[PDB]
């Protein structure tokens, strides 16, 4: 037993508890829980995981004799829970006997296997240019209203792999709208929603990622694949900053503690691809960071960038200009790369990145029409049309076989005859035609995981026939020349 000496701002100093463990769960006499962080000479600094309005000087605190642990299982699928693992949705209790500690060591060097299994987001821009494999960590970074959450939601919808959407410092109405989006798509059944909203104390925000990771690890070790989403670590960092400053830990760069990098490091590393000896399960990570005025150079962004296995930088200028998703091709990278791509995509989108790198270099010259030679003109016309293919509407994940065909169309130069503005509609109507009539081509790509010479010649004829049928929206129509 111990007695509280000081209390305020969700912090409490406790007398007694002489043999208390570090990061041990404590229980205040109103039923509110706490965490012993700082074990001082003649006090114990504790952070409160709840309301502290009826926590006072003289109140009695007891030991549990346990380090932070949270229940886990299949019961959490299609449920909305807090960090501690209590359901907020109001759809009964969580029946699960199995439990896991929040703080657990990540897989060692020997207890891993190289990532060579694609995790399809269903987004043309990502899958083609910056592919994500099972066990990989791909950062989604950019300003507010750039479409960071949208990408993660679309990824979760495309898995229709267990999903774990962790919400940190989010407003309740947003988490509700995300849940509603999953219900409409029908992706909630295999999706766990951990929620630590803005109203909750700093402790919940600090814990929210670790709880979501622990839930995912249960599947990982059993030899099953998982996808976790942190939305977002920027607010979780801010939450930890608050705690540290209240405990009177010395601040550093941007008023953050020394172990703000270490905070994100332990979290993200636990996401990995296990060896064949340990089942061969995975746990993919999609952390989010909110930049301010597209400042990649900032402290917290740079920390997470250096941890993760590639980044998908979203821009405001591109988003407003019409490029949605607004992924900057030059800056965004995938560290795994071709290993996390099927052979079909690897071949078609091998020199897509090169063509678009040349396009951006040339782009300046495009305004000055017919002042250039032939070679450069063709590249600009090609590049402009490729951009339109990379554009994708919200909440519309495409299958891998549909993507490869769409990219194959543009790269080979089947859209050169068609106007640039009519490329989007051409793509939509083409896929509908192939889905209906030429399903064998899609089926072939699904099974073989490559585009055959037969399929190439088939597609060419299908395109040519469709071009004749296709009524061009703007001005007169054009098939071939």
């Amino acid at each position: 037993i111990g007695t509280v000496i000081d209390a305020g701002d969700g912090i409490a100093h406790v007398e007694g508890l002489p043999s208390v463990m570090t990061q041990e769960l404590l229980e205040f006499p109103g039923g509110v829980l706490g965490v012993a962080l700082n074990l001082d000479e003649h006090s114990v600094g504790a952070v409160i995981l709840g309301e502290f309005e009826k926590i006072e000087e003289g109140q009695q605190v007891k030991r549990t004799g346990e380090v932070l642990s949270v229940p886990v299982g299949d019961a959490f699928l299609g449920r909305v829970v807090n960090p501690l693992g209590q359901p907020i949705d109001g759809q009964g209790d969580i029946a699960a006997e199995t439990r896991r500690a929040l703080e657990l060591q990540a897989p060692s060097v020997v207890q891993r296997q190289s990532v060579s299994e694609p995790l399809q987001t269903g987004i043309k821009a990502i899958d083609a240019m910056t592919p994500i494999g099972r066990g990989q960590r791909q950062l989604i970074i950019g300003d507010r209203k750039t479409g960071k959450t949208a990408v993660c939601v679309d990824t979760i919808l495309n898995q229709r792999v267990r999903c774990v959407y962790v919400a940190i410092g989010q407003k309740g109405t947003t988490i509700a709208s995300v849940k509603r989006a999953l219900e409409e798509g029908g992706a909630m059944e295999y999706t766990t929603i951990v929620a630590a909203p803005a109203s909750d104390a700093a402790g919940f925000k600090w814990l929210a990622p670790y709880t979501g990771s622990a839930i995912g690890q249960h599947w990982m070790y059993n030899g099953k694949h998982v996808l976790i989403v942190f939305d977002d670590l920027s607010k979780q960092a801010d939450a930890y900053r608050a705690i540290s400053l209240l405990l009177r830990r010395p601040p550093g760069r941007e008023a953050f503690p020394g172990d703000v990098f270490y905070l994100h490091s332990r979290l993200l590393e636990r996401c990995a691809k296990l060896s064949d000896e340990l089942g061969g399960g995975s746990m993919t990570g999609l952390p989010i960071i909110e930049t301010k005025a597209n400042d990649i150079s900032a402290f917290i962004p740079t920390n997470v960038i250096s941890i993760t296995d590639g980044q998908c930088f979203l821009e405001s200028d591109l988003f407003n200009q019409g490029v949605r998703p607004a992924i900057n091709v030059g800056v965004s990278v995938s560290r795994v790369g071709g290993a996390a791509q099927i052979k079909a995509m690897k071949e078609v989108a091998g020199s897509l990145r090169l063509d678009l790198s040349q396009y951006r270099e040339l782009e300046a010259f495009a305004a000055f029409a017919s002042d250039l030679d032939a070679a450069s003109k063709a590249q600009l016309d090609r590049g402009a049309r490729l951009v339109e293919l990379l554009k994708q509407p919200q909440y519309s994940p495409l299958a891998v076989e549909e993507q490869v065909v769409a990219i194959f169309l543009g790269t080979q130069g089947h859209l050169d005859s068609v106007p640039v503005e009519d490329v989007q509609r051409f793509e939509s109507e083409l896929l509908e035609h192939v889905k209906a009539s030429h399903s064998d081509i899609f089926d072939g790509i699904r099974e073989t995981k490559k585009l055959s010479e037969e399929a190439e010649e088939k597609l060419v004829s299908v395109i040519n026939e469709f071009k004749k049928g296709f009524x061009x929206x703007x001005x007169x129509x054009x098939x071939x020349x």
Binding site: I5, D6, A7, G8, D9, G10, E51, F52, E53, K54, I55, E56, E57, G58, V80, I88, D89, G90, R144, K145, G169, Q170, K171, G172, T173, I175, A176, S177, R180, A195, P197, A198, S199, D200, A201, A202, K235, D238, A239, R241, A242, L245, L246, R248, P251, E254, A255, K292, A293, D295, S316, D317, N320, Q321, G322, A367, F368, A369, Q394
Partner: protein, 451 residues
């Protein structure tokens, strides 16, 4: 009973007998050598209670008796609150009482709103349409046009609405409060409006809690009576500002840009209470100050997360003379999707943004070279973009003293059709001055002839 030990500005330390220590956020009264209301903050130890004063601490002495009420600051609630003026403490300034501190609604109770609130303004309805039972935010710099816009939104929407309203003057001008009082009196809308005031004159203790008092009143109108309530907060930043002021004096180590470490937490507790529930809904029109015209600043940066629609006022647009000076690119709305507002509206909205974005990109090139070096297509886009910028400007009903001419309200159908014709380029012949400060399409053509 207690005894005052230490006083340092609006912070006061009080001794109490071992075991009879007041609870946190409890109101303590103390006689001035008037009655000063202190609210408990921290427990220092050795039966010492650090408290935040809700009025000036001038005239206090060490050893003065301090009585414990045994509860948090209470404020009046019900139909009696309507057509009255109150302070943070909940006392009538025009000559049941529940606590201001309370937990927010559960996740089960929260409803997602997907209903259009037709303002009448072209810029808002098109590019950033507001939501019924949503959270709307007027982001703006120093002396740009926040209060003029919030007064407009009151003037336009509130009269037509049969629901009651609650205004919260958090750390703003007492002069503007007097102007508002007379404005509401002439319109005869005082009867269906409750007013709470904790102006910049008062210490930071008031500005902290004044928002809670007004919110608590609104919550009861929502919950019990079952009313669609309006909540007008001006300005929400001043709460966060007050939060920083008390935080420093309490002896908390400051965070980024010298703000309180519990900035997101303090804001979180307030903002989350402001929600529309399945039973009954509340539409919150907040004003937000942006220090140094810096949206990256923690204060405005954190607020953005809570809001469903946002209206970002920029000085660049204000300097041109475009009123209201809403930044069309930066400003955003959650409901702007083909599902809610239909494919046509979404198509026109995005197409307008595309044109304005390209115009902004060419500003750097136009600054040096000019229009001559741009292509035939770009030349036309720039011409249209400039005309679109000036058409977004509109006469405000509240701004009769400013402009001179009376305000104009433009329906949704008129708005959509107008920007449709502009994008297609049907009004390429008309001059730039024709688009400046006009509502309907008829007024454009009428002014075109005069010029």
């Amino acid at each position: 009973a207690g005894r005052v030990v230490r006083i340092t500005g609006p912070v006061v330390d009080v001794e109490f007998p071992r075991g009879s220590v007041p609870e946190l956020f409890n109101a303590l009264h103390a006689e001035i050598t008037k009655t000063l209301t202190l609210e408990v903050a921290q427990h220092l130890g050795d039966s010492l209670v650090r408290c935040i004063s809700m009025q000036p601490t001038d005239g206090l002495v060490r050893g003065v008796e301090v009585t414990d009420t045994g509860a948090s600051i209470s404020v009046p609630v019900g139909d009696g609150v309507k057509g009255h003026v109150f302070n943070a403490l909940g006392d009538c300034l025009d000559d049941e009482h529940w606590s201001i501190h309370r937990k927010p609604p559960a996740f089960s109770d929260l409803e997602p709103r997907t209903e259009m609130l037709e303002t009448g303004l072209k810029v808002v309805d098109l590019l950033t349409p507001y939501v019924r039972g949503g959270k709307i935010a007027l982001f703006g710099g120093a002396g740009v046009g926040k209060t003029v816009l919030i007064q407009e939104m009151i003037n336009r929407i509130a009269r037509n609405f049969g629901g009651t309203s609650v205004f919260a003057g958090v750390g703003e001008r007492t002069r503007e409060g007097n102007d508002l009082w007379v404005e509401l009196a002439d319109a005869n809308v005082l009867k269906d409006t409750a007013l709470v005031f904790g102006q910049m004159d008062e210490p930071p203790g008031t500005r902290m809690r004044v928002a809670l008092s007004a919110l608590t009143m609104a919550e009861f109108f929502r919950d019990e009576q079952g009313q669609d309530v309006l909540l007008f907060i001006d300005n929400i930043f001043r709460f966060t500002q007050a939060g920083s002021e008390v935080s420093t004096l309490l002896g908390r180590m400051p965070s980024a840009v010298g703000y309180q470490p519990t900035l997101a937490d303090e804001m979180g507790e307030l903002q989350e209470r402001i929600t529309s529930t399945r039973g009954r809904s509340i539409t919150s029109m907040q004003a937000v100050y942006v220090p140094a015209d810096d949206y990256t600043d923690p204060a405005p940066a954190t607020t953005f997360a809570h809001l469903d629609a946002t209206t970002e006022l920029s000085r660049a647009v204000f300097s041109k003379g475009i009123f209201p000076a809403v930044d069309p690119l930066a400003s955003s709305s959650t409901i702007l999707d083909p599902a809610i507002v239909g494919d046509e509206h979404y198509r026109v909205a995005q197409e307008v943004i595309r044109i304005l974005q390209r115009y902004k990109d060419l500003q750097d090139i136009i600054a040096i070279l000019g229009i001559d070096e741009l292509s035939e297509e770009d030349k036309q886009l720039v011409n249209r973009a400039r005309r679109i910028e000036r058409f977004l400007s509109q006469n405000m009903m509240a701004a009769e003293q400013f402009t001179g001419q009376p305000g104009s309200t433009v329906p949704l159908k008129e708005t959509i059709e107008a920007f449709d014709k502009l994008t297609k380029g049907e009004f390429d012949h008309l001059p730039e001055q024709a688009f400046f400060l006009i509502g309907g399409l008829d007024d454009l053509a009428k002014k075109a002839e005069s010029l």
